[PDB]
């Protein structure tokens, strides 16, 4: 077959019921995740190849970066709660991996302030039970599948993308193969 279990994707040994159509995991510490967001724009290109209105979810993970990794999962919950993902993703990636200016929770907060989120609303969100629940949801989703590495993408709670089997000679062809694989898995 052109798409084979074990090549462009693998199938979950313990399938996950009741999952979003497309579920992505990342870490702001994760070098391929930086590539996936800032260079390849995987999430946008997958969205463009899926039907309008398809639910796409993206969650942060705790297993990289120790204490700061957990702070970033909570900040990502803040970003989801306030709907400012598109305003903080690039400065968080660059602050962690490029300039290495994000070293504490306060440095994370500065990124939101610079993006125009008012301090009182960032702080209220950070301490809210709505955000506590979003943090639990991110941890539970990672526990549902078995997650030891990022980036990771799951389709219909059944299929896991395998980017190691796609072409890396050309970045645009890689993205096209990734997105077309997601589309194929979504129509399964």
UniProtKB/Swiss-Prot annotation:
The keyword Signal appears for this protein: yes
Annotated GO CC locations: outer membrane-bounded periplasmic space
Localization: Periplasm
Disulphide connectivity of cysteines: 30-33
MF terms in GO: protein disulfide isomerase activity; protein-disulfide reductase activity
Disruption phenotype: Induction of the PhoP/PhoQ two-component regulatory system, suppressed by 50 uM CuSO(4).
Keywords, alphabetical: Disulfide bond, Periplasm, Redox-active center, Signal
InterPro entries in alphabetical order: DSBA-like_thioredoxin_dom (IPR001853), DsbA/DsbL (IPR023205), Thiol_disulfide_DsbA (IPR050824), Thioredoxin-like_sf (IPR036249), Thioredoxin_CS (IPR017937), Thioredoxin_domain (IPR013766)
Pfam families with a match to the protein in the record: DSBA
Family from the record: Belongs to the thioredoxin family. DsbA subfamily.
Function of the molecule: Required for disulfide bond formation in some periplasmic proteins such as PhoA or OmpA. Acts by transferring its disulfide bond to other proteins and is reduced in the process. DsbA is reoxidized by DsbB. Required for pilus biogenesis. PhoP-regulated transcription is redox-sensitive, being activated when the periplasm becomes more reducing (deletion of dsbA/dsbB, treatment with dithiothreitol). MgrB acts between DsbA/DsbB and PhoP/PhoQ in this pathway.
UniProt name for this protein: Thiol:disulfide interchange protein DsbA
Annotated organism of origin: Escherichia coli (strain K12)
Annotated gene: dsbA
């Amino acid at each position: 077959a052109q798409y084979e279990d074990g090549k462009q994707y693998t199938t979950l040994e313990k399938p996950v019921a009741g999952a979003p159509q497309v579920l992505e995991f990342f870490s702001f510490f994760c070098p391929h995740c930086y590539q996936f967001e800032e260079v390849l724009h995987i999430s946008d290109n997958v969205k463009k190849k899926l039907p309008e209105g398809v639910k796409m979810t993206k969650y942060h993970v705790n297993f990289m970066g120790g204490d700061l990794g957990k702070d970033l999962t909570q900040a990502w919950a803040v970003a989801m709660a306030l709907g400012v993902e598109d305003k903080v993703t690039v400065p968080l990636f660059e602050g962690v991996q490029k300039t290495q200016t994000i070293r504490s929770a306060s440095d994370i907060r500065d990124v939101f302030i610079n993006a125009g989120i008012k301090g009182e609303e960032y702080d209220a969100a950070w301490n809210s039970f709505v955000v506590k629940s979003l943090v639990a949801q991110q941890e539970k989703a990672a526990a549902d599948v078995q997650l030891r590495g990022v980036p990771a993408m799951f389709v219909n709670g059944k299929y896991q993308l395998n980017p190691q089997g796609m072409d890396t000679s050309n970045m645009d062809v890689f993205v096209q193969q990734y997105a077309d694989t997601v589309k194929y898995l979504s129509e399964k």
